[PDB]
Write a protein that binds this ligand. Structure first.
Ligand SMILES: O=P(O)(O)O[C@H]1[C@@H](OP(=O)(O)O)[C@H](OP(=O)(O)OP(=O)(O)O)[C@@H](OP(=O)(O)O)[C@H](OP(=O)(O)OP(=O)(O)O)[C@@H]1OP(=O)(O)O
Ligand SMILES: O=P(O)(O)O[C@H]1[C@@H](OP(=O)(O)O)[C@H](OP(=O)(O)OP(=O)(O)O)[C@@H](OP(=O)(O)O)[C@H](OP(=O)(O)OP(=O)(O)O)[C@@H]1OP(=O)(O)O
Ligand SMILES: O=P(O)(O)O[C@H]1[C@@H](OP(=O)(O)O)[C@H](OP(=O)(O)OP(=O)(O)O)[C@@H](OP(=O)(O)O)[C@H](OP(=O)(O)OP(=O)(O)O)[C@@H]1OP(=O)(O)O
Ligand SMILES: O=P(O)(O)O[C@H]1[C@@H](OP(=O)(O)O)[C@H](OP(=O)(O)OP(=O)(O)O)[C@@H](OP(=O)(O)O)[C@H](OP(=O)(O)OP(=O)(O)O)[C@@H]1OP(=O)(O)O
Lengths: 547, 547
């Protein structure tokens, strides 16, 4: 069972130089089927000798090659792109490890085959020839690879790692805790009690339901995204690959639950301070500023603490999203920019908070239209991202019809705002504008719903078969989930568009903010659900085509 | 390296019947140092033949023995102490597994030694004799042990386990989670916020600082005992052995943290309901009753849920403590009954709560002396436990001087109460009684302190050497701990006695309840500390002598 081990661990590149162990076993078998045995031993040992010679030659060649490579590498390092030199060093070390493995495999193989010969031929001169020719010859007796590996570890540690031996050991030959679950629980408990205190304080404002709706939607989105990370990692959907995250260290669901719990503790504490007004030297309007200043400082924290790698990945992702038509559209850039299409209320509320704190401390009506643009920003991002994807791949259908799906948000918002500004000023064409808004509402709702179900989710496939109205490969355990989500998306895709249109117009105040406050945390739920089946379709059928 | 494996895994009892592998290797070595080889092979194979014969005979004998044993076992089970029959079944199964291991070891050993002979003697007839005599003979070809083991598993599962195969697999051949840490965190968070709400409610009663001091001391004791369990398990101090707990499943520190956190949530909720009086159909005095009714129902919960095995171990332990002079003094019975010497305030407060709810809803003064007895109950327990240990072991010194250490609590409490009842009634002998109380206070304080430091802690040993003023073997990492604890115990052992004496007398009201409320959670801390070094001395020097 060494032949299988060899053929499985043999180096693809040097598949020749390895001892033809299977061929030697074939030779021995054919032999076992005085002169006969004598001449067989003669020819067989001649074959072993030329094999040993070949291994010696190849080992010497690649040893000299690695010697020169280490020489050029030490020169180029002495010259001072630095991470590129690090990568070259790691490649060289991997090559050295591979060659050492080759040497060990050949040694073990020679011993095993010679032992097989000894046992089969009932002759002890086999091990004699072993200890005579092998173990006294180069490619086994030589240890230059050992010292090369030693000097390489030393040089990377003292130049590149500057003395951090363990981190160098991680950089080379490289193959949720208890405290994090405890903190997830701590923050969920503090958050539960603070929410109960919040409800009890409310029982025993609209410029303050608009400044905390932002925080509420963001924290709900982070909790639900932690649930998404869990429900992906537990159905095998490799999100680590699709997002292009470092597969060694990435956030689990407990780290998202902990980030969301902490931000929720901050939100609840600020809201409480707004109710049970503590020390009255500082007014009420300072707690929203303190809350969002703390959130933004947690995001752009310069010191490498508190999820530094995660926060800065997110910051690069946001920079690449908001300056959209320039960077090439990854998948994280398509995912994020398609989840500001549901957190559009966070942008509306940031804009309203800026307005209010500047001018009202009017702002909720169309601030000359600055409130109808900041609503179409997260549809503009995706419109132009799909336009760039069409400019790159030059595939007309998916990307052009995608951009046509997001243009309907522009048209719907525009016609809602125009019909509003016309009805309040009592023009004649108000009914015409209302008809146009109704048409484009139906269009955008059906457009986005159809696209969701067909291209985003892959459902309604025609190779359905047993999985009625779905695709063939389903990853989620109970088939009720997909029907629940189909019904849910049909319902909550008209809700989202009606909420956008209503938030544009100033016609229905009161019922223009109990709607945009009871429909806004529903549409983050709808995005939390769409995440499941979009990432599933990306894993299975690669509908996005980012890899 | 098979000889070492054999000698390590050979059955102690049947050490003869196993193949003398080492002797065979000695024989082969002495041989390798035509007629010579021929006659050596003859005699060697004769030895192997008689060895095989011996193994066959012994295997047949023990197979018939196990057959009859299974027969008697099935009879006795058919007859219907039941757990005793279960234990007998497990013993039989272990014997069967041991005999099967014997068979496998002999097979492997015979193959290995015959292979050694084959390789050394350059003769292939070795494996021929192997396959001829062995593998065609009983003790290898027989499989009766397999079916016996099968029928045994089946019979235990269907009669004793009634169909629970996996639990039977646990009962035979038998060798903190994530959710528990999450719940520890949840309960600690809820508890933190409820305590902050508590302090804020108090800022914005003595019959109610006496009904919640019980709960507070109990919850503090459970938190600190969880810390004790951790600091034991992390310094290797085998508390699982000393307490005689089931070493397979015992409580970690996180389960004590979770029990204490839950009871603390109940305490804080009841106290809050006493402050922010909710629905006023139910008065205030119903929350203490609800709290302690819930705690007692959590303890004596009949259904097997919520730490059933732990709670019922504790209930048996308490039954064995409170009816003291009868049961033999284990170690858990000495530990518990020596930790009601510090939770004496929980008993005082239970008695005061009964008094109050019966008569005052007077009670805090000596209720005709029922308040000076319920203080000496947890010293009476230990007095009589040490008396029984002296009656059993008939070792005068440790147990008699122990009971003399606990009699001083009786004398101190008695003289405090008498001097009080004499001074308030203005007798002449009040100063005499005060002198007697002072004498016995000094006596009890110094007595218990000296005993703590010397016999309970083992410190002040005279083989100290480098560990000044301590013993030789220390288990706790930093030597500052032992000096901190020496100083702490010296301080807080006068505090405890002054608090007991004060709680006896009614002379210093106000300062008779800010003292018994600021000294009571200090003396549970002192017991939490004494736990560390008492259990350490029990692990190391076995000062208690319970095993
Ligand atoms: O049964 P055979 O003769 O056809 O197989 C051989 C077997 O001889 P046997 O009859 O059991 O005495 C063992 O030889 P041996 O006692 O000298 O042992 P050493 O090699 O010196 O240790 C050896 O097992 P092993 O002891 O290494 O584990 C095994 O090597 P290999 O495959 O690497 O083993 P596995 O990968 O299967 O474990 C041999 O080669 P194959 O034919 O390829 O299997
Ligand atoms: O060098 P900087 O500061 O500009 O950049 C970072 C680098 O700094 P440093 O070398 O320590 O001074 C490492 O930081 P760090 O040690 O805190 O992190 P670790 O504890 O080592 O994780 C980090 O290591 P690591 O994430 O690969 O393990 C590396 O990840 P990067 O290679 O992007 O990751 P991949 O592309 O391989 O996925 C970062 O980006 P680079 O610039 O590409 O190196
Ligand atoms: O070299 P020797 O003569 O001193 O040691 C023997 C060795 O010979 P070789 O290496 O071929 O020259 C191996 O023979 P073999 O491959 O035919 O045996 P198999 O039938 O294949 O098992 C065998 O290794 P291995 O194959 O079990 O892995 C080893 O078993 P042993 O170490 O007891 O077992 P472990 O203690 O390692 O578990 C033998 O026994 P010893 O003398 O006690 O060491
Ligand atoms: O039989 P009952 O009801 O009167 O007593 C219990 C027994 O009931 P059952 O057999 O299931 O009907 C088992 O309950 P269970 O299965 O819920 O617990 P498990 O899930 O199996 O743990 C338990 O098993 P287990 O603790 O040993 O594993 C056993 O522990 P006990 O032997 O004391 O422990 P040790 O003396 O060996 O330390 C209890 O005491 P016994 O009376 O001595 O058996």
């Amino acid at each position: 069972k060494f032949a299988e081990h060899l053929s499985a661990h043999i180096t693809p590149e040097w598949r020749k130089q390895y001892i033809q162990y299977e061929a030697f076993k074939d030779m021995l078998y054919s032999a076992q089927d005085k002169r006969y045995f004598a001449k067989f031993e003669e020819k067989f040992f001649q074959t072993c000798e030329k094999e040993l010679a070949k291994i010696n030659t190849f080992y010497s060649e690649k040893l000299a090659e690695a010697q020169r490579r280490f020489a050029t590498l030490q020169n180029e390092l002495q010259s001072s792109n630095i991470k590129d030199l690090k990568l070259a060093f790691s490649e060289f070390y991997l090559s050295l490890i591979l060659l050492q493995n080759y040497q060990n495999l050949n040694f073990t193989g020679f011993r095993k085959i010679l032992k097989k010969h000894d046992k089969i031929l009932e002759t002890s001169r086999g091990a004699d020839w072993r200890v005579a020719h092998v173990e006294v010859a180069p490619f086994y007796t030589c240890k230059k690879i050992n010292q090369l590996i030693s000097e390489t570890e030393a040089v990377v540690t003292n130049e590149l790692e500057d003395g951090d031996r363990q981190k160098a050991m991680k950089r080379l030959r490289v193959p949720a805790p208890a405290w994090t679950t405890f903190r997830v629980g701590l923050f969920c408990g503090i958050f539960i009690v603070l929410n109960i205190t919040l409800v009890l304080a409310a029982v025993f404002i609209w410029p303050l339901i608009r400044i905390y709706r932002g925080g509420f939607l963001l924290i709900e989105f982070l909790f639900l995204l932690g649930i998404n990370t869990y429900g992906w990692r537990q159905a095998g959907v490799n999100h680590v690959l699709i997002f292009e995250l470092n597969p060694r260290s990435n956030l689990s669901h407990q780290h998202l639950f902990e980030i969301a719990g902490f931000l929720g503790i901050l939100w609840c504490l600020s809201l409480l301070a707004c109710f049970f007004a503590p020390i009255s030297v500082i007014p009420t309007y300072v707690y929203p500023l303190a809350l969002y200043g703390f959130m933004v400082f947690f995001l752009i924290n310069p010191t490498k603490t508190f999820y530094y790698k995660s926060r800065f990945w997110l910051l690069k992702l946001l920079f690449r999203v908001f300056t959209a038509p320039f960077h090439k559209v990854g998948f994280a850039d398509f995912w994020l920019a398609d989840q500001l299409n549901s957190l559009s209320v966070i942008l509306m509320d940031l804009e309203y908070m800026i307005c209010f704190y500047s001018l009202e401390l009017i702002c909720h009506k169309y601030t000359y239209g600055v409130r109808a643009i900041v609503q179409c920003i997260p549809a503009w991002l995706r419109f132009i991202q799909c336009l760039r994807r069409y400019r790159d791949t030059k595939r007309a259908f998916p990307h052009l019809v995608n951009a046509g799906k997001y243009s309907t948000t522009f048209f719907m918002v525009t016609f809602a705002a125009l019909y509003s500004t016309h009805k309040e000023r009592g023009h004649s064409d108000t009914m015409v504008f209302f008809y146009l808004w109704i048409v484009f509402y139906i269009i955008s709702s059906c457009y986005t719903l159809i696209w969701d179900l067909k291209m985003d989710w892959g459902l309604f496939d025609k190779n359905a078969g047993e999985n009625t109205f779905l695709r063939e490969e389903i990853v989620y355990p109970q088939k009720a989930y997909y029907y629940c989500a189909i019904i849910e998306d049909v319902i909550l895709r008209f809700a989202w568009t009606i909420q956008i249109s209503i938030t544009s117009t100033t016609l229905l105040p009161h019922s223009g903010d109990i709607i945009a406050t009871v429909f806004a945390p529903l549409e983050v739920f709808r995005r939390f659900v769409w995440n499941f089946f979009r990432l599933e379709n990306e894993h299975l059928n690669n509908c996005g085509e980012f890899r």
